[PDB]
Design a protein around this ligand. Structure first.
Ligand SMILES: Cc1ccc(Nc2nccc(-c3c(-c4ccc(F)cc4)ncn3C3CCNCC3)n2)cc1C
Length: 127
């Protein structure tokens, strides 16, 4: 099986805006997570072909990854910070759904998720 197309990261029909919360998500949250020692499996769409995971996109029907999230932020694709936060949550829950408790990739996701939650606890009030 081929990989599916990646999620949309640009739509010229969508209205755009900048908010201090979206700037924080890009400049602080995504930066902090990207540099984490466990980030690398999460920095791009899951390449099921390359990794020989025939069942990944049979099980995961709402794919998400931090590469996609970053592109969405850089493209001003998100209107609301909540959209971005949901995409992070989708990413982590996909990892948990595909794998099993205690799997190394799951422990890696948990660590990134704990860090994510800590950073979004510091999200500035909407300016
Ligand atoms: C030792 C090793 C070698 C290569 C990789 N690379 C890699 N890249 C993208 C995906 C996954 C992956 C995911 C996954 C990752 C992100 C996500 F959002 C949802 C699911 N869930 C499982 N996997 C692999 C399945 C085969 N065994 C390695 C993990 N692994 C990782 C590790 C630990």
């Amino acid at each position: 099986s081929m990989n599916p197309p990646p999620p949309e990261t640009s739509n010229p029909n969508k209205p755009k805006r900048q908010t201090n919360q979206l700037q924080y998500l890009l400049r602080v949250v995504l930066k902090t997570l990207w540099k984490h020692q466990f980030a690398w499996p999460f920095q791009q769409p899951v390449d099921a072909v390359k990794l020989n995971l025939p069942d990944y996109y049979k099980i995961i029907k709402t794919p998400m990854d931090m590469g996609t999230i970053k592109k969405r932020l850089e493209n001003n694709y998100y209107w609301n910070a909540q959209e971005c936060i949901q995409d992070f949550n989708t990413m982590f829950t996909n990892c948990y759904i595909y794998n099993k408790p205690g799997d190394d990739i799951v422990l890696m996701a948990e660590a990134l998720e704990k860090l994510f939650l800590q950073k979004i606890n510091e999200l500035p009030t909407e300016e």
